[PDB]
Structures are given as C-alpha cells and as structure tokens.
Amino acid sequence: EVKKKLEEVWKKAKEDAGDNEKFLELLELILENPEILEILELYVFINKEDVVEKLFDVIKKAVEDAGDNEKFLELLKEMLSNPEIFEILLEYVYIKKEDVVEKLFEVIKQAVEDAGDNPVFLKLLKKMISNPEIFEILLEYVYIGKEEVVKKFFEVIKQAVEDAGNNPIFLKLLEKIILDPERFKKLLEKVEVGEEEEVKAEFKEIKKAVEEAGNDPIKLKELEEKL
Amino acid sequence: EVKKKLEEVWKKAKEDAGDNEKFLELLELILENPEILEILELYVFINKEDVVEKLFDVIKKAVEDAGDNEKFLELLKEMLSNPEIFEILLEYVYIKKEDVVEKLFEVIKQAVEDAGDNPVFLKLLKKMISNPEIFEILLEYVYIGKEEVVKKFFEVIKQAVEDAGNNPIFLKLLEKIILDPERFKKLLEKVEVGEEEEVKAEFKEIKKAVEEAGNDPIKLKELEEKL
Amino acid sequence: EVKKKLEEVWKKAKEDAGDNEKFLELLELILENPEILEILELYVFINKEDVVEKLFDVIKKAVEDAGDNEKFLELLKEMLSNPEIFEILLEYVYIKKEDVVEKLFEVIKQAVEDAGDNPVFLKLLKKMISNPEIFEILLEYVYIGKEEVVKKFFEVIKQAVEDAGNNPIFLKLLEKIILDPERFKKLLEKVEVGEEEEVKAEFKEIKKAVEEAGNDPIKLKELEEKL
C-alpha cells in the first residue's frame, strides 16, 4: 500500500505542475535520496500523506517565488538533502506551521539576493541552515514574529565577511563562532535587544587579535583557545 | 601474502556454500566495502583468518536460519556494512563468543517476525543495532544469560510505537530517548527489575505532554528540553 | 572570474610538471572532490591564488621527494581528501609556513619507510594524521623545532603495535587511546620530557590487563571503563 500511496502523490503533483521545471528536477532529488525517501515511506504508513503533500506545495511555491534564482535553488537542494532538515520540515507541517516555514524560506532568499556574488557568505549560509539546531532556532524566531532579527543577524554576518581583509584565518574563526548553536543564539539575543553594533565591535576585536599574532601558528592557537 | 590468504578464504566458503544464495550475495557486500575489507586485511596479517572464517560461518548460519526473511537480511546488510559493528563482531569471535553473537542475531529476527509490517519499529531497530555502544550492550546482556529482557525491551518499544496515535512528534522523541546509550541502559535496567509497565507509564506521560502542547513549536521545544 | 583563475592555475602547474605522473593523478583527485574544490574557489575570490599555487608546489615537491613510495602516496590522498586537513594546510601557507608543512610531510614518510609492511601501524598513521586536532598538534610541534619527538612518538607506537601478541583487543584499545587528542598530547608531553620508556611501561600494563581478563567480554568492558 505504501508504494501505491507514494507513486500516487508523485504522479499527482508531477502532473499538476509541468511548467515548473525547477520543482520537477528537485522532486527527483527527493526520491533518489534513500534517507529522506525512507522518511516519506514512514509518513504514509503513519497516515499523513497530506503532510507530505503540503510540504511539496511549500517547496513548489518556493521554487516558483524565487524563479530563476540559482543561488537559492542549490540551497534548497542542500536543505532538502539533509535527512534531519527535511524531517523537521515535515514536523513543521503536521503542527500546521507551513506558513512559518515559507517565511524562513524567503528570508534566506533575501540574504541570497543581498549577497551579490559573495560565495563566502553563501557557504556560511549553507553551513548554518543545514545545522538542525540552528535551523530550528531560525524557525522558532519566525513563529513568534521576530523575523527581521534573522535578517538583521544575516546582514551583520554578511558585513563581517567583508570586514575581514580577505584574511582566511578570521573567516574560519568567524565560522566556528556562529555555527556553535550556543553562541549562535547568544548573538541572536544581542541583536534582538539592540546591540547590532556591539556584536560587530567584538568581530573587529577578534580580527585585530588575528592580525596581531599573524604569521605565528602558536600565537594563533591561543586565540582559538580564548573562546 | 595477505591477498592470497583472503582470496583463499573467499573461494573456500564460496565453494562450500552454493545453495545459499543469500550468503553469496551478502559476502560480496563485505568485499565491496573498503572500510570493512580493510578490517579483514588487518586480521589476516595479525594471523587470525580463523576469526574471519568463523564470522563468515556465523552469518552463513544466520542467513540460513532466517531463510527468506527479507526484513532481517536488510538488517544484516546494515549491520555488516557498519565498520565498527563488523569489527566488534570480529572481537566477539577472537574472545570465542560466537554463540553470544548467534543468540543476539536471532532475537532481532524474532523482533522482525513479531514486527509484522511495522516499518517505524524496523527503523528504530536498525538505528539502535547500528549504534556501537548499544550493540555492545545487547551482546553484554546475552552473554550473562539475560536474553529475554532484550526481547522484553524490544516488545515495549514495539508497543510504544503503536501507542503513538500516528503522531510523528512523539515517535521522533521516542527515538531520541532510546538511542541515547545512557538512557538506553536505564530503560533496560528498569525492565530487568520488573518495571515493564512503569517504563510504559512514562511513555504515556510524554505522549500526553506532546498532545498537550500540540501545534505550538515553542511549547514543544521546552518538552524536548525537559529531558 | 573565479572559474578562469582556477583553470589557469590548473593548466599552469599541469604544463610545468609533465614528467611527474604522481602529481598529475593527485591533482585531479583534488579537483574531483567538491568539498575541497569549494575551498579552492573560496580562496580565489578571497584573492589568494598564490596560497593555492604554493600548496600545489609543496605537494608536488612531496610526491617528487618520496618518488615511488606507494605507501606514502595513499596517505596524501587520504590527507588531501579531508576538507579540514586540506584547509588547515591552506592556512599554513597564508601564514607563510610552507616549510613547517614540508617537514611534517617527510616525517610521516620516514614512519612509512620505517613501517616495513606493518599495515596496522599504517592504519593508525592514517587515523591520526586525518584528525584535525592531532594534525594541528603535529604541525605545532614542528614549527617550534621539536620535530624528532614526533618521530620518537611514531616509533613508540610502531613498536607498541608489534608488542601486542597479535591481540586485536589491545590494538583496538591502543587506537582509542592515541586518537583522543587530549591523551595524544599527554603522551607527546611525556616523550618530550624523556619518559619514552615509561609511556611504554603503561602499554605493557594495559596489554597485561587485556590478557588477564581475556575471553570475558564483561571483564573487558571494565578495562575500557578504567581510562
């Protein structure tokens, strides 16, 4: 029965959307992934199916909204390929929060449109929206309504990447600071209270420390220890 | 020399078992996996070979006992593909505990026969028998002789999956509770003392809490924090 | 622009080194790996390129020095395939420490030449030089000048593998002791002070404990707990 339920859901949304080539090529990535296909098969035996049918429509209305934004489509492929990110979306549809997901799906599109050929910020964007704890935190900040603070933190990160002097040492350190979910929420907390410039005041502090030690790999190891 | 020793072990057990197609198709999965083939090559230079020869016979007598139980053969492929599970088996043969492995190999077959088209319990079964710490705990409970408590815990989990109301939130929470090896042994400890119904009394407590909060993703985050 | 910068760097070093087949077949492994190719693309947008150009010359002068040492070329493939090891090398070139990398690249070649058909020590060598924390510690010990203590620890490990009696239990325990970066530096600290024989005195202590418990999987679990 589970094989018939899924292939019906496949042929249904496939036939209903033929003009959307970006959703057709993305739906097959979902089927070819045995880990996330295993989630769909467990969700039809659990008598959801509509939860899977609603998640397809959210991403179908997502690839249609962005349209020919290729730097956002590859994000969705990285997100929908992650079995935990794909499953926390299915759990944000059984809870009936398809709107909270759609909002977050668009604030990252705005960060991509604002990126403007900044592949270092794109890698940081992929790296945090693929972390289950960070991705849940971003959804939990949008359901409350504090959606612009996510845009505000995304901008402070985008500007901190530019305020690096092309120094790969500080960019790697900036990665290890924001990816840690404990420090990620602390920086979101300071942006939500108004310290959007004081959080940046510490990024310059760390960048100055990187340039102070500089070409000494031992002097830099202590800086990574000082966190 | 190591290449000749292995291909001799290959052609030996291959020729001695031709009527067993399930062991022939499974032996090639072992050879095609470079990680676990690297374990076999280190075990012939270490002058075991018989340890590898005895492990093949255990799984050969395992695919023969289950026979055409396809829901158990895919388990063995998931277990024998894991390089740490495959290696902790080779270490339970040098210790001369090929019997303790055979018992555990059959209690999971009984959980599969008792499953009866319950793919959610099959995913939980794969998820815990692939954890090295959990797999060692299951072997260590059988060597003592307490083998039915493993069957007893497997049944309480199988029934807790059914006692979910098709709620994907509680099934994901039930997964994160039993996969943690520290909580896994605590639930095995309470089943070994007789509290087979009191452990279930807490599963209803958590399921009631899931339905209490329900469609609120913030109210559910605290429930996952209350562990 | 980033696509043109890289293919220029590719065709440059490719044309300048045609007699070195080992560097040509290794350079294509770097390009075929999307994770580490993503690092190179972020390093040309960051206006390095020379950092990538210098890293290629370090490994080109590495495959040329070792020559037809196949047991060292497969090491470099395992190291250069790791996206974090490959990136911590790019950060040891922007710091202008291409010499500290070249030294460590040769002390592992000496451990391979001294290995002499000891595949258990080769697996331990791959396992620790692929750990980012351990690999950074090995670089940080060479930049100071304490390079022979790395050779000294590599020899004590190579001899501890032989002093195992072909016991797979103690070899797995010896693996879990040295791979832990906290214990890895403690053993390097005791070798740097002169206790090259006292660290070995504890390896016999653990091996004697393995043979004492022996064929009891419960008595051995406590030994792994006693760390």
Numbering used by the authors:
A (entry chain B), B (entry chain B), C (entry chain B): 3 to 229
Quoted from the paper:
Here we describe a systematic approach to generating modular and rigid repeat protein oligomers with coincident C2 to C8 and superhelical symmetry axes that can be readily extended by repeat propagation. Repeat proteins are composed of an asymmetric structural motif that is concatenated several times in tandem within a single protein chain. From these building blocks, we demonstrate that a wide range of unbounded fibres can be systematically designed by introducing hydrophilic surface patches that force staggering of the monomers; the geometry of such fibres can be precisely tuned by varying the number of repeat units in the monomer and the placement of the hydrophilic patches. All multiplexes follow the naming convention CsHRN_Rr where s is the cyclic symmetry, HR stands for helical repeat, R is the number of repeats in a single chain and N is an index to differentiate between multiplexes of the same symmetry.
We determined the high-resolution structures of five designs from C2 to C6 symmetry by X-ray crystallography, cryogenic electron microscopy (cryoEM) or both. For C3HR3_4r, the overall C-alpha r.m.s.d. between the crystal structure and design model is 1.21 Å. In contrast to C2HR1_4r, C3HR3_4r has a large twist, causing the interface to become staggered, with the top two repeats packing on the bottom two repeats of the adjacent monomer. Notably, C3HR3 was verified to high resolution for the bounded four-repeat, bounded eight-repeat and unbounded fibre designs.
